[PDB]
Amino acid sequence: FRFIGSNNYYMHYKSNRMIDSVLESARDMGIKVLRIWGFLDGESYCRDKNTYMHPEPGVFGVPEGISNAQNGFERLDYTIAKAKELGIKLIIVLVNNWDDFGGMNQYVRWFGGTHHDDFYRDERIKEEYKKYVSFLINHVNVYTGVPYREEPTIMAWELANELRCETDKSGNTLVEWVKEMSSYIKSLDPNHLVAVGDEGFFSNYEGFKPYGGEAEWAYNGWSGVDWKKLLSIETVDFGTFHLYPSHWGVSPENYAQWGAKWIEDHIKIAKEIGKPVVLEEYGIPKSAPVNRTAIYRLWNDLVYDLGGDGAMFWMLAGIGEGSDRDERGYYPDYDGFRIVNDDSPEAELIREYAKLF
């Protein structure tokens, strides 16, 4: 099973019309897998979307006494039930490295810590994360009757979006946390694949250096991620990596070739370990002084020809509503990476590649 996929982060709090638009767009484009957020941590983040999943420790869903709110598990249930109908598989990510939708820092605030990376080390935090993941994995979808643990529309659980641990550049803190949490998830759910959800950084591997000497920090262990060690964990089934040369310090004239080397290096390493590998986010800013579609073509050709298992662009959006609606009625392109099901050369390329994978 090899695929073209995409990402969408608003499938757990937007309306039925907007969720149906994304999933129908995915089906129309041939996109087989969508990677979505399965978290909304913190009372202020929940209140901002009027949608609740984990507003305080041990509170899963809407707090007693709050009326007129959405329950993010109900919205995720709708998304799963619609994906099931439309034939789209989902990867569901269980916490954010970043502060959007609360993330690890929200857990650290609840438990009175003093650094983001306390999320990996404080046993009271680790316990709360497991309590949340167990609630979610066991949740019975109100539209299907099937608990997420048994739902084949979910392709994989992912531990943490773009996890980093800059305070331990040995990589050991993350190896230990990933071992613990991936084994924990396998103990709850022996049916589903588990992956980390990290960006794929290396930690000074002999013979692996960046194209052009740019973004050496992604190759030299600065973020505390040792991708090869994470992929060798028994309870991790496939490798994940992300690709954003414009964020990482690469020059525009080197975006294509830096990304090409990055893909080649990840596929070579995962093939030696013997596990599948997915490029599960990639993006070039719409305004880059290079041909974005031609870079995307290059990168998708490399994944396809080298035997990578999937390539998923960040990100797919559909129709918008209310304050998230642009000049064409779509959810806006806030970050410069949005693709929609239109006549753009990027949309045309994705449709073309979805026919090949």
**142 near 79, Cβ under 8 Å?**
no
Instruction: List the structure tokens of 349.
Output: 């390329």
**131 near 110, Cβ under 8 Å?**
no
Show which residues are catalytic.
162, 281
The resolution in angstroms reads 1.5
Instruction: List the structure tokens of 179.
Output: 């071992």
Tokens 């970043």 belong to 98
Task: Annotate 54-74 with b (16+ C-beta within 10 A) or e (fewer).
Answer: bbebeebbbeeeeeebbbbbb
| Helix, strand, coil share of the chain (percent; to 5) | 40, 15, 45
Taking each helix axis from N to C end, the angle separating 16-29 and 345-354, rounded to the nearest 10 degrees, works out to 60
Nearest C-alpha neighbor of 205 from the set 250, 259, 256, 272? 272
Nearest C-alpha neighbor of 212 from the set 258, 244, 252? 258
Taking each helix axis from N to C end, the angle separating 292-306 and 345-354, rounded to the nearest 10 degrees, works out to 10
> Per this entry, what is the length of the chain?
357
* 250/163 Cα distance (integer angstroms): 21
User: Is the alpha carbon torsion for 173, 6, 340, 329 positive or negative?
Assistant: negative
Strand partners, 241: 279
Nearest C-alpha neighbor of 164 from the set 217, 88, 85? 217
Element (H, E) at 82: helix 72-86
Q: How was this structure determined?
A: X-ray
Q: What are phi and psi of 35, to 5 degrees?
A: -95, 125
**Domain 1-357, CATH number (from 2.60.40.10, 3.20.20.80, 3.20.20.70, 3.30.1310.10):** 3.20.20.80
